[PDB]
């Protein structure tokens, strides 16, 4: 029927708590496939300088061998089942998930346990991963958007442990011994810091039984935003990359929805996007655009003018359009077993509960033009920003010019 009724149609995600602390969540559906994964509340933010690349290295070698079966055997079993075994690591989250058939739900869950509980850190495999990661860092150096975002994080958080990259420095990965990885696993991969989330054609009782069988052996038991800038000049690069951000509220904040609407509200730029990267207690709200050498200043002016217009003069039609865009993006994102499973895991990790879609719609409905402009002025207006520019960066206005453009003399 209506949008609200359709949201009510969405099945709930049953959540149970094991004895050791593991939080098992599921969302029953009629799909013949499923995606079962383990989300660990451990990331680059929790890593000191000694082991900045520990989590990434463990992500690399997790699928290359467990104690019960060698890495070749594990990969062969995954391939024979027809499933896809994938993993990712952010500065605050880690995840190992398996996209499989519903009838393969048991084995897959067991597999996850073998990946998490008893991980085999073969020294030869560790050296192979060292070589591979040393190659991979140089490979990733080509992608300038990720380099720009890493620059932005490093300059924005600096002294905070939130500024170090997920990959970690070359010297760190070179010297990252096996004992360091084992200590990282021991101190980090432990319930209740973990969530086993599944979606698709899965029954919550079956998932709970499998979690108790294979994930019951797990042991029972100041962020600061600095408005700095970084600009790496390289005129040989064809286009300049710019990412400018300001402090954003963490996961637990009602203002996130209004900021999402404002970003949705926001062509000189060849490719211009708006990001609202949220963390536990901090966040980066801003824009990333690619530019010609001769048009950086105009694009920065246009973006800051849009920011000021939202902060001061936010009309009702634009806010309604932003709310509709946000609703459509929210509903369309949660299409497919993998996206909903990832949402379940992350939401349990950050928000708690699962924040159903009806509450999201009600919160969006609360949002108003007055609310949009008030929150934008709260977070954007007259705030010292963090800027990251990858060459050719010469026409990019100096930090004082950008900071001055962060406010209006007419207002």
């Amino acid at each position: 029927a209506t949008f609200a009724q359709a949201l009510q149609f969405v099945p709930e995600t049953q959540v149970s708590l094991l004895d050791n602390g593991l939080r098992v969540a599921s969302e029953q559906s009629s799909q013949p496939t499923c995606t079962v994964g383990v989300w660990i509340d451990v990331g680059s933010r929790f890593e000191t300088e000694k082991n900045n690349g520990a989590g990434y290295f463990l992500e690399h070698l997790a699928f290359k061998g467990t104690k019960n079966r060698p890495g070749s055997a594990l990969e062969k079993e995954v391939e024979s089942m027809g499933a896809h075994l994938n993993a990712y690591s952010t500065r605050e989250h880690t995840a190992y998930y398996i996209k499989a058939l519903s009838k393969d739900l048991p084995k897959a869950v067991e597999l996850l346990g073998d990946i998490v509980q008893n991980c085999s850190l073969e020294d030869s495999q560790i050296e192979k991963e060292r070589d591979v990661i040393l190659r991979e860092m140089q490979e990733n150096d080509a992608s300038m958007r990720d380099v720009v975002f890493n620059y932005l994080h490093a300059t924005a958080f600096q002294g905070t442990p939130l500024a170090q990259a997920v990959e970690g420095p070359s010297e760190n990965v070179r010297k990252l011994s096996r004992a360091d990885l084992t200590e990282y696993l021991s101190t980090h991969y432990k319930a209740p810091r973990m969530v086993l989330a599944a979606a698709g054609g899965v029954e919550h009782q079956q998932l709970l039984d499998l979690a108790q069988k294979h994930l019951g052996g797990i042991p029972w038991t100041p962020c600061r935003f600095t408005g700095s800038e970084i600009r790496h000049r390289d005129d040989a690069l064809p286009f300049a990359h710019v990412a400018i951000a300001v402090e954003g509220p963490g996961w637990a904040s009602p203002d996130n929805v209004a900021l999402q609407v404002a970003n949705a509200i926001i062509k000189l730029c060849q490719s211009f996007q708006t990001f609202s990267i949220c963390y536990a207690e901090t966040g980066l709200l801003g824009a990333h655009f690619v530019c010609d050498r001769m048009k950086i200043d105009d694009m920065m002016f246009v973006l800051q003018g849009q920011w000021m217009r939202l902060c001061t003069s936010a009309t009702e039609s634009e806010v309604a359009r932003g709310k509709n865009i946000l609703r459509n993006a929210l509903v369309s994102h949660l299409d497919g077993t993998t996206p909903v499973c990832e949402d379940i895991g992350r939401s349990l990790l950050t928000y708690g509960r699962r924040i159903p879609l009806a509450e999201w719609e009600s919160r969006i409905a609360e949002v108003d033009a007055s609310v949009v402009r008030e929150i934008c002025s709260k977070y954007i207006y007259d705030q010292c920003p963090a800027v990251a520019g990858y060459g050719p960066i010469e026409q990019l206005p100096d930090y004082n010019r950008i900071r001055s453009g962060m406010f209006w003399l007419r207002f």
Partner: protein, 54 residues
Amino acid sequence: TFHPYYTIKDALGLLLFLLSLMTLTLFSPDLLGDPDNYTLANPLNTPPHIKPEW
């Protein structure tokens, strides 16, 4: 860019220049002057120490 850096640097220069000028006009207005210029011009007698401005 000259707008956010040398504008304030010049403004400070203007402030210092006005400081010097106002102290020169308000405390020693005749420091850089010649007293003989305060007598009405007399084309029949050249002052003993006729000199141009400094």
